[PDB]
Amino acid sequence: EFIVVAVVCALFLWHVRSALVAIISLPLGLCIAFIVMHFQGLNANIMSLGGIAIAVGAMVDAAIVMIENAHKRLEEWQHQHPDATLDNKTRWQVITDASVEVGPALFISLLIITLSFIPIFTLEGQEGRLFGPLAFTKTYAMAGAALLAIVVIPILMGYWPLNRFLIRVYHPLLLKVLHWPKTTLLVAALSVLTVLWPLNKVGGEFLPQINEGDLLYMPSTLPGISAAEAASMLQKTDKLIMSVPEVARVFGKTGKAETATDSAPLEMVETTIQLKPQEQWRPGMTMDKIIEELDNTVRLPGLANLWVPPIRNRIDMLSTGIKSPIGIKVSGTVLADIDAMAEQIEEVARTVPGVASALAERLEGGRYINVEINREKAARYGMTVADVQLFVTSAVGGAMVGETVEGIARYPINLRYPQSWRDSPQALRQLPILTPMKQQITLADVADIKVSTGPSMLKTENARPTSWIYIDARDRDMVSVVHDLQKAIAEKVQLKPGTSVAFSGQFELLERANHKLKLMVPMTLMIIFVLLYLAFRRVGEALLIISSVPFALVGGIWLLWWMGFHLSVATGTGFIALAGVAAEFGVVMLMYLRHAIEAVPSLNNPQTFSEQKLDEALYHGAVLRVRPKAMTVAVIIAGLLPILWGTGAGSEVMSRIAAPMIGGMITAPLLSLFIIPAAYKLMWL
């Protein structure tokens, strides 16, 4: 990004030392940002560096503007007086005057950017913790850049073909626009109204699928399997997963590790598949196709396959508890009603075209061998309840009795009967019982043993039983399938008194972030308007240039639709950031145009029917002011194209945040170039 920005600056100014003066603002801004975030206590991660990479161009624009202005002033001075006659005194004077002529506007523009992206600190929770560092570092970098531009840049600027084509292409369009401004504003309104077409096709999700070098495999199955069978299933599924050429290691495991952070019982597979470096396969096999091949290769009837990254999966399980991205919780107080409702919902969900699989957790899926100890019979032989259940807690059981020490180690002891006495319930009814009377009897003479069903594990959220339903959909959108499931389970499934249904997982966080972003726009607009009145001291110009963000939004959403991205929190942040850049471009344009209209033409209008010289002032404000705007737009787009076309680690979020800004910086400036002069001419009359 730094290299490309330097190249663009050197190609636009065609002066090496000017390019150096322009780019020296980036390293010092980076240094200031790093110092401030070290003082605060942040570390270097994807978000911080992403914020700095996003702020690169927004911090170089203000310096290149002043550099171009000083260039023009020096050129004019040289054109006025003979060459080969100069000294440091007059040069320093003219450079300082040229810098002061345009400093305040760009300073207030950088302040606009900063304090208009500041309102994103209101995010709370997962998205807040994710986007905190980004906003922090972006604000720090922009503040340092503004400080340097208003303090340091003049000093080292005083110490140290293409535009003709732009003018030739701009002249006639500008004239024909100034001829009729009303029709121009009308076609602008229509170009804003034509935004409703892509908004429907753009999807919706919480966050992009940030892919890493590994991925988890956690299938859902019934708890009715043994230990040896579970180990055999693990072995066969691991050997089947290893059959894919993009797998280096496979470490499968069932049950739990010896830690409190793992509560998984047996019958629950959790494998960690390690993928080879992506430089070891055909450059056309993405992660989605690898997941598809894995899903198609390890069918293994009896499992509901699920593939997710480790970090994201564990963060989801921590924040919500549902491993899958989409999930439905059925609450209530009765277990039978909850189980029936979960079964119904699970059976209805797998008919949605986008869903790939759906599985509900059963509550009553546990087999019990109930031994009702009759107290009358147990008393007839003279033995308490404890004495008759010791024959099943220790003989048929094997509970621990103690532990032996060996240096530092310790190992437990067991005690139980042989295996031939726990074969079948009929083998229990024949258990030999040595009564306290030193007698021989069976277990059927003192207790009735039968087989039944009941709860295997009781999950309760907020002290209320709940049943979770895991949904898996990889082909269709997230919000689309969520709305489809809502409609389906609200149409063809009837509720029962005492039970509720709630969508959880990514959808709750998505809705929270959506509400926050929806209520966050007014603050940004108000800050922009305040800082604009602070610079132009008029409400007219403030509203004039603040009415330019809609074009930016239209362009951003169009580019989002064109690139195939979905609407998420990253795109929201992108729009909240693009608003400020659009406002900054409008400020620059209107400031230059205003100086133009202020200098010459304040004399002819008092004589009515005088519009010939009013257009020449606008022309002058669109002949001398064409290079700065083109340069700002070029550097803004060039400092963002790299992170847009980037394909690496963590590039998903940055590309999603950059796409809206690059989309808007092509539509808002191109339209502003014709809407600002038109509306300003209309306002001056």
Partner: protein
Amino acid sequence: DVQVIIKTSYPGQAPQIVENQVTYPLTTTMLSVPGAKTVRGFSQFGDSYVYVIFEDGTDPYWARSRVLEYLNQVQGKLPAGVSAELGPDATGVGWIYEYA
């Protein structure tokens, strides 16, 4: 998030008994801790886990210090041999390195 794990062992007790005598008094007691956002909890044939997730902007150690008090307050009601032990100072996302 800020999560505290409470793991209790009840040797050989059907899920319903361990849920009535161990998990319920813990899930209903931890909901009164200052700053507790939610309290998940599930009991198995011999164990009972309770996850207390707190609000945003809460000190990771203030939460443990405040959960210890309610643990002491509820210890007087648990069964004879049952004892609720606090979890480690890490979470599920803390699994950094794994070897075989």
